[PDB]
Design a protein around this ligand. Structure first.
Ligand SMILES: *Cc1c(COP(=O)(O)O)cnc(C)c1O
Ligand SMILES: *Cc1c(COP(=O)(O)O)cnc(C)c1O
Ligand SMILES: *Cc1c(COP(=O)(O)O)cnc(C)c1O
Ligand SMILES: [Cl-]
Ligand SMILES: [Cl-]
Ligand SMILES: [Cl-]
Lengths: 305, 297, 295
């Protein structure tokens, strides 16, 4: 499977083969888990975790939505997140904290299963997209699956069950020949990708999409701050698929996707048909920030060493 | 059970006992009435009615939505509201102006019943925070009921929600709109605070609160950044603070929603400061906000 | 019929009489066409087309929504538009560019019909009373509301007919959720306590007149906010007005038989309208950039 190595399991690191849970775990049956996507980027000062506290804060916030009790102080989880990097001797890596309801009972109500089991795993990237691919840009296709209304699934939380919607949309997009899916909300407005927030640029202005039913991305937040620091005007608005069709540029953000320009949506080219200068510039500054080359953004980094 | 005393009835004051209307009144059958909630607070210079002008304007605006004709000039209603306070010797009181379609006919169309009958009555009138529960009743879409007006019929929705919330052990209900976003309480506008920024909910299908308006101005004067946004229930769950505003509720901190504590689980500093400046304003202790007060004496 | 005169038909001008297309044209059966509305106003320096490039850009943008191919460069279309005014001797006129899918086939899919055929035609050019329509403007995933696609106007046509039959001048469409959207072909604004409120784009077309009015309003010193609005927010507004190439800035004095403010055209709407007219007729140096002098 995934080459994670030593995994933190409820308080102590164990070999990957020991990082297993009962197949009767509530979360494996009812999607009652919460997770985070965190990255450590190598610097000449060792690995630096990007916006660790903001991600951990969201982790506990997601748990609160499910009334899930995480039996560890945020400080303990933060230490575990730094340790999973050190103990495995990783430089750059992806970190996946997970809290899930165990196998105490299988009634749909997860309360009797509290407190939640928790683990932190991390693994290295197999490959990265090169500048050629980034410039060609991602191709999106609008999904036939709508992102869930705000009173159907908790869209501000990274709750496991939520991703059945993301999985269905992603599979559909790939089957259609696209790189990613663009989900609309039930009313017909653009929501977000299967796991990425959307932005578009028109006549010099950068438009971030309102939160609506989307997750409040930390990369999105980072990109907006960076854009403003560079002197760009940033507006937050609700958008339709055809506002994106006629945008000068479109790009998406996410911990895994960083800043990814989108060159085509529903087989309709965006602007020049390749990544545009704004998205390529934002991506560069963002990468400079996460890899510790921007003193003004060092506050966002937590050095493991 | 209400100790209203002298009530202004279509032009003249009469004892509470005499303030009655036909049970064939259109409004008692079809909810065709409009009302307001106005408060008078005691100050060093006597009772002061808070934002009288704004409330009366909305009273007439609500009537317009129903194509209801109020047979009095706003100035006359304003005098009656001041008199209801004076004549009853009130200082701190709740004032309830009410215009309703009468008993001329009972066809559902209220036009034949114009002009409306009008009456004005009044009666003498935290850190733990209020507990809310999200309702199973959604606030009406903007093309179903006039959500910007205080129309009587609208409150069947509020009544159902409030009843459900209290039965569930909460202090107030939090209504969502039909699309699933947060709307407002049964009779209060909502706000939340996150990372130092105050978020006032967009008007959407909610009533444009005068207390909400007041709080925003106060917040800005204090130096807080205020953003007007649409919000989901979980954005509130993760807020540092959340509070409600309304004439009766003033500025009320909300410490818990759906049994999920908000922030520290007790009233937060921001909501408390806004409430304090608001109470200072309505009691005549803020010169910069004196324009909002109408002194009875 | 319309007194268009010489019409540009896929590259060359021909008498109106010859400006015809097969009744088997895809667009005549399935609404697969795109168009624009552009005006030329007389100025001291001759006819001037208002914001020509922005309109042409939207024309091509509308085509992209339908994956329609326009076999001419924007520059060529812009020249044709200027020429339709010159050749016909027009001073103040309405210009109607149109790109439509032809008669190559009649399967609903329009791709086999590309490239589109194109034509450019032109003709010399109290407060409105509105009634809220029983037809909702289409959701953003039902019809492309940011594009001037022919088929979209069946919705506008139905709303307009209803409004007129009800005794009003124009229709006010709500979106499916119940919020105000726009008129059959005009963007909406309202004024309350000195502030001008432009409606968010939601499912509406991004009007060029709306854009011009917002800039003018800001330049005059007005505070402008962009919001979502309900019908009763309009009922209680001090003023309500709508914008569009044909409607310019039109004040709205009544909605659903409920008077707006004074019940007559208000000062803000009337002023924006007058300043807009001054801009399009070349009397405001600050807005000269928006004009294209034909001569
Ligand atoms: C994780 C996630 C994102 C991206 O948020 P980041 O904090 O930028 O990683 C966006 N949308 C969804 C649905 C997500 O789960
Ligand atoms: C009266 C009312 C409010 C609060 O408005 P205030 O002007 O602040 O008193 C909020 N929501 C509803 C539904 C109301 O009826
Ligand atoms: C053309 C149109 C408008 C007006 O836009 P302008 O660019 O100002 O002419 C508004 N709504 C619709 C549906 C339209 O087709
Ligand atoms: Cl397609
Ligand atoms: Cl619960
Ligand atoms: Cl009516």
């Amino acid at each position: 499977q995934i080459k994670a190595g030593l995994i933190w399991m409820n308080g102590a690191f164990v070999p990957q083969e020991e990082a297993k849970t009962s197949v009767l775990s509530h979360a494996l049956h009812y999607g009652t888990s919460v997770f985070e996507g965190i990255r450590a980027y190598e610097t000449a000062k060792g690995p630096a975790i990007f916006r660790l506290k903001e991600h951990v804060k969201r982790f506990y916030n997601s748990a609160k939505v499910l009334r899930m009790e995480i039996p560890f102080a945020p400080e303990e989880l933060e230490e575990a997140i730094k340790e999973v990097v050190r103990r495995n001797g990783y430089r750059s890596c992806y970190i996946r904290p997970l809290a899930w309801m165990g196998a105490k009972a299988l009634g749909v109500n997860p309360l009797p299963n509290n407190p939640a089991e928790v683990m932190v795993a991390a693994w290295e990237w197999g490959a990265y997209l090169g500048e050629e691919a980034v410039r060609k840009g991602a191709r999106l296709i609008t999904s036939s699956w709508a992102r869930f209304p705000a009173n159907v699934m908790p869209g501000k939380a990274k709750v496991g069950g939520n991703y059945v919607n993301s999985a269905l949309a992603k599979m559909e997009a790939v089957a259609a020949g696209a790189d990613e899916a663009l989900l609309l909300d039930e009313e017909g407005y653009v929501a977000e990708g299967s796991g990425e927030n959307l932005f578009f640029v028109r006549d010099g202005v950068i438009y971030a999409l309102e939160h609506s039913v989307n997750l409040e991305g930390i990369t999105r937040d980072s990109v907006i701050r960076i854009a403003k620091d560079l002197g760009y005007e940033v507006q937050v608005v609700r958008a339709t698929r055809d506002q994106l069709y006629m945008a000068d540029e479109v790009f998406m953000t996410g911990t895994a996707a960083e800043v990814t320009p989108v060159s085509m949506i529903d087989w309709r080219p965006i602007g020049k048909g390749t990544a545009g200068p704004v998205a390529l510039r934002l991506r560069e500054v963002y990468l400079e920030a996460v890899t510790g080359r921007r003193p003004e953004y060092e506050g966002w980094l937590t050095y493991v060493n």
